Symmetry: C3
Subunit: 283 residues, 3 copies
């Protein structure tokens, strides 16, 4: 009746209390393990993928030098035929300009043009950029570009100079050539270091397409650069410490270890009792 129900309730709450205590002990051991692992250098890391409905707009830092940005536009899955190559027109995108001292030599000041990238991967959104360089005594006509995760973070950055140097430290620098159109499909990788900081890196796939110049031969001295930026897939890659990335495996291992210790203690007590009984029976 009432007494049996009260006893059952007391037993259930005591079970819950002991479960809470066991969870606390297991969590403390896991916290100790993670604290030890965080101070290791070069640990083994695991990989995971996560799908996104829409991407945060990335930042494309271009280094045209003397080349003038002729045109930048947003398109969906297709680029309409060029109205007049080599002519300025239709320049309407979110762009910023930043000068910063190169972190590797300190002799050269890099001037970068930051462009907001595309967001809608599931609609094949494209950012199409056209540059024109009048003349250059240098060989290997190319424009260098760099990719970073967020344009908004750069916009609200307190420094905006150390941000660009930190971006240059990342391994996301490439070049695209003149006289060609480069289709770039970018992929996002995020690595979680033991300090808690996130390092963002970009993979790329490229398609290089020759450009046919029907402009007059007198106008062929200038060089035209065409580049297209889009997201390859809605999957973001995440590299994280193998123990920290999957806490549940370590929790299961620790629970098994504790239960094994309890079992071993019970067997030791049983063996002690057995030996005591054997000694008593013998003498």
């Amino acid at each position: 009746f009432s007494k049996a129900c009260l006893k059952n309730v007391f037993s259930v709450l005591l079970i819950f209390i002991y479960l809470l205590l066991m969870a606390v002990a297991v969590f403390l051991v896991y916290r100790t393990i993670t604290d030890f692992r965080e101070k290791l250098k070069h640990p083994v890391m695991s990989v995971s993928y996560k799908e996104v409905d829409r991407y945060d707009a990335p930042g494309i830092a271009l280094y045209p030098g003397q080349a003038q940005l002729l045109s930048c536009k947003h398109h969906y899955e297709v680029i309409p035929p060029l109205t007049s190559p080599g002519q300025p027109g239709d320049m309407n995108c979110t762009t910023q300009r930043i000068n910063y001292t190169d972190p590797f030599s300190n002799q050269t000041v890099k001037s970068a043009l930051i462009v907001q990238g595309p967001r809608e991967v599931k609609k094949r959104e494209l950012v199409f950029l056209q540059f024109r360089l009048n003349k250059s005594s240098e060989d290997f006509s190319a424009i260098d570009y760099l990719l970073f995760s967020s344009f908004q973070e750069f916009l609200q950055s307190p420094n905006r100079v150390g941000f660009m140097q930190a971006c240059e430290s990342a391994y996301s620098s490439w070049k695209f050539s003149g006289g060609f159109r480069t289709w770039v499909k970018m992929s996002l990788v995020k690595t979680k270091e033991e300090d808690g900081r996130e390092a963002v890196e970009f993979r790329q796939e490229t398609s290089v397409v020759n450009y046919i110049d029907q402009r007059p031969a007198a106008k062929k001295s200038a060089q035209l650069f065409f580049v297209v930026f889009e997201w390859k897939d809605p999957f973001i890659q995440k590299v994280q410490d193998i123990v920290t990335a999957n806490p549940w495996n370590t929790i299961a291992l620790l629970c098994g270890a504790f239960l094994a210790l309890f079992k071993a203690a019970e067997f030791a007590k049983l063996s002690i009792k057995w030996m005591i009984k054997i000694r008593k029976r013998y003498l």
Copy 2:
């Protein structure tokens, strides 16, 4: 004797029965967990690789437009020197032609030429294709291609039109340029969605090689396209829900949780008995 053996057999079969019951309960809990997980959106997914002796022949959907397929051939690890570039000859491969309305605009009807790809990765099998385009008023001379997993599935597809649209929805579209030879190394990725459907995607690595035209200057108006398709490695990538991909980790976690619950119940019973005995001894 007989009685002891019978008792031992009964105990062993009872142990097996209880093990079956525990396995049934653990499987039911795992099934409930997976049913909950399947209705989540954008979960964390794990990656695995599997080696294959031979590949299923893929489907290469090319969009030449006005370009004529001059030649297609299968080679092993090397391509013999061209007998006569720009001339038709040696066109012998499994090819099919399909017209379908583009799923993104519905104004344009895409005409695709499907080619059966290579299978023997361990023999470096190559599919070599040569196209020729007489003239084109458009710039950016390129031919678009798409990759899908199985040519046989397309061959036996009941629709053959929705199949191509679904393939176009996948993120496996690229282009290759004229006046160059493009060596394409493809890699296969298969993603298992929670609905049970498999999404197939292709990664690519490209080598672009300039083509030297020794044909007469009067014949240089036409543009030549050369493309090579082969498998990069015998490893197929598989991306799957992290809980579903490794059921054994979840099984171990659930077994540990159940044993912890049993241990907690035993400790609660022991504590109840201890307190009852203490109360009896005190008064």
Copy 3:
């Protein structure tokens, strides 16, 4: 006092002995499982990443044929402007030459030039190579290259001929074109087979940049090849058998299975005692 301390010490050492025995049994079962898995063909494999402070210098096997290696140099993050393209000069790197019969046809003897690659990824170390080919009646001007893990291993190899054939068996062969500069970012993948042997493979990302030739028109007959080699990131990928790569998950599963078996045995004994008591009470 002394007796209680001695009893506690004996109990603790017996607990340790039983824990050692349980660990031995679990390790034996895991060893049996791994021995069974090692004889499987095409198993499921997991992936992990490991960071490195510095890379072991790789081996770049180039196949110039009739092209002469004009220049090879080591640079950090930037290549100074060319003093005089097409002219020999500044050839100072660790290079070796090897002839070996091709393992696929045995009719052709491949002559390879091995170059020691870069090591310091965190300093963006670059290996820059320039070749010059006087004339060639063949089309598709390209130079084939292959990548292998260690130059030192090739240097101390007892055979040096079977080593190159085994390297050619690996899926790390590409080409780079003349009249262009190819920036190659390489990534290292190591696969552990069940036999214990390690297979090394290379991924690559390429940037192709057009080269502007201001040399006199009489000197344009020769073709110039420019290639740059560097490491993309300090992360090495490792693909290994899923059971062997994460032994701790299997250890946790086996510990849970053993504890479940012990629990089932205890429940069977309790049920046997219950039924015996019920039979005694009834009659």
